């Protein structure tokens, strides 16, 4: 609020106080593989161990990456257009990087959008797989004096576990590589992680189903001797505020 | 852009100064700042003290970092001052009264 | 595989699994030496490990 | 300028300097770069600077600022100077008699 000068004899006036709710709504996602019993009988005789070692994993990692991928650009990742009733994702703020060659210069920038502003300094930073390999190897430009040399020494062609103060996870869920079919030029988003809060409301494990018609094609699964792997959970994304998110695109 | 202003203070005597206050992106651009090259270690941080966070002190003058001295929010348009320097032992304020916070009902 | 929003009464949908294989066929290599036998002997003589 | 200057009067291998006259504008022009971890010297001031405190050596040469090298509000159009580097003891200055403060009524 804003005071005001006031005389001995004027008017001592009043201000307005400015709030703004925000609201997420729960949503569940599911994951379903259609395998026959020819496979099934396959994988336990011939001992390959597909279904525990290879296949579950790949679900169990398919909702991680839909949580991702609702906080980043609020899509429903089969279809990749637009999910409806998710409103606001991380990727449309109006803080935007021009992408230069220097990555360790154009992420401090990022940074600098948010700390410039008065915001609670950043402390995560998500990026895509090339990216976070070009930050990593960032050896010094010509020129300069410690040139040649690697700006970070024990990367070793290996993504950053820590950056200079700010925590650093790097997954291809950044762009939505496979997920967009344009995909969204964005290279890494950086801010203050804590002002966006979400959750697992319920999180099943991997379920085997084995009867009925789930996919709803028509095709039963006792019908035509083939069983179902499905994983499904229950998720929510809330964002307190969008301008304390800077964005790296090309 | 800053030695300039302590130039302009220090050249005409004056005392040297020993008060700052930054606008937050001025204060950021500040503590991130890079030698510029034709100097040696051209790359390296400035001021490795601080990072992403506004300084304490700068080179014997006490920094301060606020939205004030823009007036970002209360101005109408935001008055083209980014920084300010100057001998703060000549400003003299202070509180003759305050008062808590009361609850009128 | 990718995941899939549905709501109450939405039908919840499949994907599928890419899969893949490669194949080696075993071949084989040899390597033969032909040395006379009165080499041998040398080479039981001299005491010069040639051959072993 | 100082590298260069120093190099004037220390380049013919004659007349060692020592002893240095800094502006309090020029004092600032300095960068306050310091030798890395690599080399020795290490965590030391490479320049005369103005943000190091109780700086009074500097490559074996003396040290002191004062508004008075570059003229000061005592001069008008300034003398333009901003650092004097040189043998000191070839001056002699002295006080021949130094009066107290006296009130003439």
Redesign the interface.
Known sequence: P?AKIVGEGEVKPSASVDVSAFTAQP????????VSDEFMWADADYRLGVLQDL?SP??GA??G??VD??AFHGI?????KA?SAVHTSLNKTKNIVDATDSATADL?KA??LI????LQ??NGVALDPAFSFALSTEV??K????AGQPMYPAAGFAGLDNW??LNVGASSTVSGA??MSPASGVKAIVGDFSRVHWGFQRNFPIELIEYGD????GRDLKGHNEV?V?A?AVLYVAIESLDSFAVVKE
């Open positions: 804003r949503i569940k996602v599911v994951t379903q593989q259609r296949i790949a679900l398919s909702i990456r839909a991928l609702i429903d990742p089969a279809t990749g999910a401090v940074v600098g700390a410039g502003a008065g300094v950043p010094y430009p020129g300069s004096p410690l200079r103060g496979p997920e789930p996919d709803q094609t179902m499905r499904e």
